């Protein structure tokens, strides 16, 4: 983990050597174009977290009468929800761990008993369902039932002013990464033929570097388990 | 009488002595090779996707 602007010095001293949007002495980029980089940089987390399962994060879901969708939004957090238009709350976080959207595809869903809840099970009349990839709907909402929901994450978005995020958290092996994706988007802006030609040797760069990480299997991607269908199907 | 009245009865006598041999002397390796083969046909069909 580190600060934002170690990122903004790395680019300065790397990729972005040459540009004309680093300061004076290559020791940050200039202020006006920061949201530029920002805006990239986040791009480029998305897509990593995407081809990559390195983060995987729960989130907790009280069902409420009368209600079947259950939108993974932050304004109907305990901790983001305004009470004028809400009238209560059902995804329940911390006030240091506010919920921020973060979800991407979800793998498994508990209840509060400890009973597996299978997913767009159309034959199952007990399953749940799923009509948006982050809407999570339920047929019949008990009285004390609450559901858990483990899903894959994508990295919190940064942001420059002080209360949001400022931190990166994504394995040091990706860095080359992270840097070619975002010299890739910059390149391209630029419309000139010479910067183009660079632009698309950052993104093959870029995807080698990924296939490397896979071909290695260097973030634990690969999981295997025990095998239970012998014991199920009876070959005792 | 005037002896001991026990009798022994050996299934395969061995050279100057009382105590017999089973079928299970000659037959220790091969139950356990027979065995091994056995658990691997069923491994092989029980694990595979059907």
Known sequence: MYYIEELFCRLANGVLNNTGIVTDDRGDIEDDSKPFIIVAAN???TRLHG???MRNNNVVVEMQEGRTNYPLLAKYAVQSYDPNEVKCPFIMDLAGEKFAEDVIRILEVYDDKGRRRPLNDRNNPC??????????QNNAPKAWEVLNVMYQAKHPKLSTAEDGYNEIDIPDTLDPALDAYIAY????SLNTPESSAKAAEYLSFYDSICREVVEYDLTSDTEVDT???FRKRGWR | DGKLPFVLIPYMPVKRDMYGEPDAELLGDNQAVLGAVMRGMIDLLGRSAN
């Open chain 1, 51 to 53: 081809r990559f399962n």
């Open chain 1, 127 to 136: 399953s749940l369902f799923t009509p948006r990839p982050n809407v999570l």
């Open chain 1, 185 to 188: 988007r910059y390149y391209t």
């Open chain 1, 227 to 229: 095998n239970t269908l």
């Open chain 1, 43 to 45: 791009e480029a987390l």
